[PDB]
Amino acid sequence: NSYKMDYPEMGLCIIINNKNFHKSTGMTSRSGTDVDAANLRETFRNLKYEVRNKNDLTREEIVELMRDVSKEDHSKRSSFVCVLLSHGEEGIIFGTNGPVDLKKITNFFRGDRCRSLTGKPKLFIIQACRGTELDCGIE
Amino acid sequence: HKIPVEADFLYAYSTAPGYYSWRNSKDGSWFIQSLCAMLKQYADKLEFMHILTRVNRKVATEFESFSFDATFHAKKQIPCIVSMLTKELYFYH
């Protein structure tokens, strides 16, 4: 069958849009991510999500943002969506000042750790490098 | 009668494990560009898993890197669905 989607609210959509990093880090400013973050906002608004844009967070504001969202009462929402736009590498997202483990962010939403979301679809859209291999195509 | 704790997560990566992810400096990233378009087009006709498959085909077939750096030029991208869902997911009624 299908997940239940006839709850009162469709659910939260968190967009974390990091485009400017600290100089001490030496990764580039990510141009166009605003175009991304705005496209996301409009699309999920049409899917009836309570969209929340956040911009340029430290690796610690990210953890703490996510922890707060994990302890909200989701009992009347159908699903949960998170989008992350940033630099990365396999298993790792970059706050504005350095890396965060992906499993750390997601662990707040485990079945034992976020009861009001147990049994409900938790979606995670990640725009970030997962390393440094290049695909040269074929044909 | 319980369920696994990692169950009902979905991970929609923009790219395969170990690889660069491509973004356009004016138009935004290939993946989010293609995701929003496919969601606009098909979320009242198609189950999510199939939408992301279309998103895979859009990125796969229609995008190719353009760089003044021959190292990063003419390169491709395949996105990576990682589904631990347990039901189908529809956005309409």
Partner: peptide, 5 residues
Amino acid sequence: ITVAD
């Protein structure tokens, strides 16, 4: 032009 994330 297209850049790496």
